[model samples]
Target: LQIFVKTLTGKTITLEVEPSDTIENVKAKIQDKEXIPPDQQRLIFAGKQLEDGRTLSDYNIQKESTLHLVLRL
Candidate 1:
């Protein structure tokens, strides 16, 4: 699945992921494009917060989904 990760600065990062991908894995991919650490990134989609242990399938998110990536303390 392909999804768009909208960052704090309005930059969108496109990533290819599978339904089995964990939220932690998603952050790892984002770190490849941006220097931010996984723990520092918080992902939100469908107005719900995503957890590190959860998978894309858990949220029913598929292709073309857009997730907001916000910084955390």
Candidate 2:
């Protein structure tokens, strides 16, 4: 499925990933695509903060879902 990733730069990128991919995996993919490091990234979905330990299923993320990602200083 493809998910919408909104970055702090006001850019939204669509990523194609498997249904089994976790939220952490999405974050990692975003980091790679956007050239942002893991330690400096904060991915949020459904207005809630997301940690690397949680899966997409755990967060009940759906296809074409929009997630917010901020750069942490």
Candidate 3:
């Protein structure tokens, strides 16, 4: 599986991942590619915050599904 990550700044990146990867896993990739650490990142889907322990499939994420990251202090 892969994560289509994008931002309000008009940037986008496709993250290579497994569907079973946890939100924490996803956060790590984002940070690895950019600079937003796990603690500073907010994972979300369908308007709900994604818990660190949960997998993307828990939210019914499918192949090619995109996700959004909201940066906050």
Candidate 4:
């Protein structure tokens, strides 16, 4: 499935990943595309913080779902 990732700086990227992919895995992908380290990235979906050990499916993430990425300095 594909997910929409948005950053506070108005950056947006679409990532192709499986529902089984871990949130940590998604963070790694974001790090690759956005240059923000996974540890510094806070992914939020449906008003909740996504846990690193959790899978996308665990959060009920769907295709075209928008995830907000907050970069911590």
Name the regions of candidate 1 deviating beyond 4 angstroms. Answer: none
Q: TM-score per candidate, in order?
A: 0.94, 0.86, 0.88, 0.94
* lDDT of the structure predicted as candidate 3: 0.83
At residue 58, what lDDT does model 1 achieve?
A: 94
lDDT of 4: 0.92
Ranking of all candidate structures by their lDDT, best first:
1, 4, 3, 2
Model 1: weakest 10-residue lDDT segment is 4-13
lDDT tens digits by residue: candidate 4, 1-73? 8999988889789999999999999999988887888999899998999999999999899999999998886
Candidate 2: global Cα-lDDT?
Answer: 0.81
Error of 3 at 55 (Å): 0.6
Ranking by TM-score: 4, 1, 3, 2
Model 4 regions lying over 4 Å from their true place: none
Every candidate's CA RMSD: 1.0, 1.3, 1.3, 0.8
Clashing pairs in 3: none
Model 2, span 1-73: residue lDDT tens: 8789897768888988776777678878987887877778887888998878777777888799888988876
- Cα displacement (angstroms), candidate 1, residue 10, comes to 0.9
Superposed model 2: Cα runs more than 4 Å off: none
